[PDB]
Structure formats: structure tokens, C-alpha cells
Design an enzyme around this catalytic site. Sequence first.
Site, PDB file in Angstrom:
ATOM      1  N   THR B  44       0.789  -1.081  -0.128  1.00 44.22           N
ATOM      2  CA  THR B  44       0.222   0.010  -0.019  1.00 44.22           C
ATOM      3  C   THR B  44       0.893   1.388   0.077  1.00 44.22           C
ATOM      4  O   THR B  44       0.686   2.204  -0.788  1.00 44.22           O
ATOM      5  CB  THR B  44      -1.278  -0.080   1.308  1.00 44.22           C
ATOM      6  N   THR B  45       1.920   1.254   0.741  1.00 39.73           N
ATOM      7  CA  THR B  45       2.862   2.485   0.853  1.00 39.73           C
ATOM      8  C   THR B  45       3.525   2.496  -0.017  1.00 39.73           C
ATOM      9  O   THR B  45       3.971   3.747  -0.431  1.00 39.73           O
ATOM     10  CB  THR B  45       3.667   2.418   2.444  1.00 39.73           C
ATOM     11  N   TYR B 107     -13.374  -3.461  -2.639  1.00 46.99           N
ATOM     12  CA  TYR B 107     -14.347  -2.953  -3.657  1.00 46.99           C
ATOM     13  C   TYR B 107     -15.495  -4.025  -3.880  1.00 46.99           C
ATOM     14  O   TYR B 107     -16.644  -3.727  -3.822  1.00 46.99           O
ATOM     15  CB  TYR B 107     -13.673  -2.603  -4.859  1.00 46.99           C
ATOM     16  N   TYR B 133      -3.893  -9.761   5.195  1.00 47.30           N
ATOM     17  CA  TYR B 133      -3.832  -8.280   5.333  1.00 47.30           C
ATOM     18  C   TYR B 133      -5.167  -7.742   5.636  1.00 47.30           C
ATOM     19  O   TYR B 133      -5.913  -7.801   4.510  1.00 47.30           O
ATOM     20  CB  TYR B 133      -2.836  -7.783   4.219  1.00 47.30           C
ATOM     21  N   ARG B 138      -9.856   0.449   4.291  1.00 46.24           N
ATOM     22  CA  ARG B 138      -9.184   0.706   2.759  1.00 46.24           C
ATOM     23  C   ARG B 138     -10.176  -0.352   1.693  1.00 46.24           C
ATOM     24  O   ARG B 138     -10.391   0.050   0.490  1.00 46.24           O
ATOM     25  CB  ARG B 138      -7.818   0.429   2.509  1.00 46.24           C
ATOM     26  N   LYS B 161      -1.193  -9.430   8.611  1.00 49.92           N
ATOM     27  CA  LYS B 161      -1.094  -7.992   9.208  1.00 49.92           C
ATOM     28  C   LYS B 161      -2.603  -7.266   9.729  1.00 49.92           C
ATOM     29  O   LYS B 161      -3.422  -7.292   8.672  1.00 49.92           O
ATOM     30  CB  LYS B 161      -0.705  -7.128   7.969  1.00 49.92           C
ATOM     31  N   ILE B 203       4.184  -3.827  10.306  1.00 50.07           N
ATOM     32  CA  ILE B 203       4.500  -3.542   9.140  1.00 50.07           C
ATOM     33  C   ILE B 203       4.439  -1.938   9.002  1.00 50.07           C
ATOM     34  O   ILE B 203       2.975  -1.525   8.691  1.00 50.07           O
ATOM     35  CB  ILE B 203       3.988  -4.381   8.200  1.00 50.07           C
TER      36      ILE B 203
HETATM   37 CL   LIG Z   1      -4.146   6.613   5.681  1.00 51.89          CL
END
Ligand SMILES: [Cl-]
Lengths: 291, 291
Positions: B44-45, B107, B133, B138, B161, B203
Site C-alpha cells: 500500500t505504502t 471493492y 492483510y 481501505r 497484518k 509492518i
Molecule cells: Cl491513511
Amino acid sequence: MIAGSMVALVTPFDAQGRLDWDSLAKLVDFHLQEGTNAIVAVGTTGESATLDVEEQIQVIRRVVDQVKGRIPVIAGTGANSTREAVALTEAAKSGGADACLLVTPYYNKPTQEGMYQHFRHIAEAVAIPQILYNVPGRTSCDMLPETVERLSKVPNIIGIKEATGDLQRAKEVIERVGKDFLVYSGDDATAVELMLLGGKGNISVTANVAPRAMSDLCAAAMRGDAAAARAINDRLMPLHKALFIESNPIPVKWALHEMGLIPEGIRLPLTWLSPRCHEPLRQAMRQTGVL
Amino acid sequence: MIAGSMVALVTPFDAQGRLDWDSLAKLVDFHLQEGTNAIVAVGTTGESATLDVEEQIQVIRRVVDQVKGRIPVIAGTGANSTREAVALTEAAKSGGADACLLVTPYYNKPTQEGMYQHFRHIAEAVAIPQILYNVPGRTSCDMLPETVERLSKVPNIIGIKEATGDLQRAKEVIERVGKDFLVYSGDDATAVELMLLGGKGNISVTANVAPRAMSDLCAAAMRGDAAAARAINDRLMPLHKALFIESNPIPVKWALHEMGLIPEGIRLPLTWLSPRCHEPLRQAMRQTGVL
Ligand SMILES: [Cl-]
Ligand SMILES: [Cl-]
């Protein structure tokens, strides 16, 4: 008119998960017959997530080619990458879609300014009408009315699918955007009210199984015959609810299969409707006269 | 062993948005020097959402090749299509990653059973250790403890995670899974408490800019030295908060640029950190001694 009852069309698959073109053609003919005003191909209900890029443009091309301009075909071309969204929208334009429907980026949670930049880029990059799509319950991000307002001033962005089912939100959006900028419902249960507020259509899951009633509902609501629109909607309500008894499009696919319209295929991570849900759905379908 | 401080590494880009390999090499060196216990690439990051499939394997290979086995390299290979997740996970294994980190489908909102089938399929399709995860904020879906427990019993799934920041959830997951099934934090502010409960790592976004402190935090937490771990966490807290002042990784990329480590590229629909957020974040970095 890109307005009225706009079916959020499922994508049929055989038991192996392959595209079932024959069944898709049957669905198109069903919609053309029963009064549906536009088809949305490869959106949320069409399992865009589990279709690859090539499959998606294939679905769009087949639907466009069968419809032969009789009603608008709208292509779901949204993505959480702006580059990707441009690629899908471009494909859809070349494939002869009349307009594209673009979900707000899911998962990556762009800022309001980021959403503006995304949609404005795609709008300038590809000369095809584009429709915004706000569905916070799926994307994990909410495009606020002021952002919708700013995007409504961008040439080529023609409307928004507002799928929150929040009628105060709907009202606020309608008040802020121009009369040419069409607000569509993406919540079947409340769509009638959204249209009575000044909205101009419903991008409908229920229209998959009751296209005539939904096309009647939208026509009534959009000419201000509240009582007639509400009577159809109240009748359909058990069906609206049961189509969401598991995540869409799991129930609607089961319903279409039960009606004899599509095979039993659905792609992982979606699963075929749970046995415990068969009855509630079946009798909502019997009660509304779809089965 | 995959445990301790595991940086959710950013993916650096030039101002044109192209991959910056020199910058990436510097980041890896930073982590190898500062006590980081593992690198997560293209999560994600790392802006997996805006990297294409070819770019993703490229980043993973470059990181894998520079690390040369010194610490584990974990690849972000999650997708909302089971077929796509298999393709990414397969590419990562072949590219030399030591494990894959796979987000629950975003989604499309699969059922719990759909999530079980998705992850069980990937676990059986690719022989590489796999980390679940859960990030409902999100993905718009929550993998409940019961599902985590079921998946903890599947060969090749080695951990999760847990990104909710809910310590009751963490405690419940820890109680239900095996001691060999590792629970890692995905929430910087609460990671210390998660590790004190029995969790085995973090993480971390913050580890991008404060790798030694985060390493030290994780070491203390995992050996049960609560006062020491809490002391580091309390000192870092203004930074933990400021790195989320806009959606991650918008802040941490601004931070790393300010520290001279990466160029100013971020891919739409993400945007460069807003002016009004510069002062709060810069001051947090000054206060913590990062600047
Ligand atoms: Cl965020
Ligand atoms: Cl749903």
C-alpha cells in the site's frame, strides 16, 4: 437519452467461469424488449473486478454491436490508477460505447483534490462523455458535494451515479450541480425519491430481473407522478432488499439463473449465493411476479 | 524469521512519475544500516495501485537483488481477483521474494466464505509463504477472527497484518490462531500494544523515516519490556500522527523527500502533500529528531 432505467448488467459466465456470449445476447434482447433505457456493461454488477482488460473491452464491444445504437451503452472504465482509467476509457470509446462510468479510486483513498485531478485528467484525455460514481461503501472514500460541484464544471463530465442511498446527500448534490448535469441513483430502494428530487435515472441492479417495472418506475418518477412511482417501488421493495442479502452481484446472478437467463458461473472471490439465502430470494421473486 | 520492524517501503519516482532506481537503492541501504528486520516492497505504502504488473515485479526484483538474502523481502501481491492475485504471487516467487503480503479483496466485498476460498486457492496455487492483510478502512470489508482462524490452518499462510488498530480484535486473533501463526500490526500508533499482547512485528509506515527507533521499539515490545517500548512509542507519537495527516503514503513520501532520500514524484490519483500540512509534518520530524 442517457437517463431513465439504466441496467447495471451482470456478465454471464458458464460453470467454468468463461464468458457466456449467448446468454449475454439474450440479456441484451430482454432489455431492448422490456423498455430499459440504457445498458451499463462491465460495472460493479458486471464483475469488472474479476474481468481482465481484454475481457472487459470484449464484453463492451459485443453489447455495443448488438445494441446498434438503439439505446445508450455505458462502459464501466473506472480504476484506482489514473493511467489505467485513461486506458480503459480509451478502449471503450474505440469500442463504440456512448459514455463511460468511472468509480472513484477504491483502496488508495485519494484526497478530494486528488479525485478532482484524476477525473479532470481523464475528462481532458478521452473525448467520450463520462459519469462519476460515488460508492463509499465499496471504495472506502467519499467524493463530497463540493468536489462533485467542481467536477460538474469540467466539459465532458455529464453526470454522477450517487450510490450512498443518502437522500440528503442526493438533494445537496442536485442543488449544487447544473440542470445539464444528471444525478443518477445507485441505490434501488431510494432511487424513486432521488428522482423525485430532480435526479434523472437509476443505474439499477433490480432492473436486471424486473426491467419493465423499473422502466415504469423511472418514467413515473421523472415526470413527477410520485404516487404511481411510489406504488411500483413499494411493490418491488421485498425484491430490492433480497437482491442485497449477500454482496451484489451474488443474489442477482442467482435470480437470473433461476429465471433461466444465465448459467451458474461467478468468479472468485465471489461465491454462488449461499443455500440459506435461496428461499428469501425465491419468494421475493415469486411475490413480485418475476418468477 | 519474518518478525520485528518491517518497513512498508515507499516506491520512489521522479517528477515525471518514472521509477527512480538510485533512490530505491539508497532506501534499501538506509534500512540495511538502521536495523530494519524486513522490507515489504510494492504494498500500500509502495503505491501498488498505480504500478502496473511489470513495474511491480521490477521493483520486487531490484529490492530482492540488492538485499541478497540479508533480511526477508516480502512482496505485495494482493488483488481483488483470485486469478490476478495468483499471477502476482507467482511472479513474486519467481522474482525471489521470501514471502507475499496479500490484501483481502477490495471493492467487491466477498463473503467470509469467499475470502476463505480466495486465500485457500492462492495458498495451494503458489508455494511461497503468504501473509494476510486485513484493512477494512481501505478494502470496505472485514475478515473476522473466525475466518482468520480458518485460514491460519491452511499450509503456506504464515501470518496476518492486522491493520484495524483495534486491540480487542488483535487480542482475539492472537488467542484463536496458533503460536506459529504470526500477527503483525498495520497501525503504527498501536503497534506496541499489539506486540505486547503476543504480536510478532509491525509492518510500519513510520519505519520509513525512523528505522532504528522502530527497530528498537519492536525489539523491546517483543521481549516484553513494556516501559521501554512505550517510551519509544510516546516519543514517536507526533510522527505517527503526522504521517497520516493525508492518506498514506502522501505524508511519508513528503517526509522522505524533505530528508533528501527520494524525489518528489507521486502517481495520480495520489497528490503531493497539501501546503497546509507541510508545517505540522515538518515540525513532527524536527521534534522527533528525524530532521
Ligand atoms: Cl491513511
Ligand atoms: Cl452489496
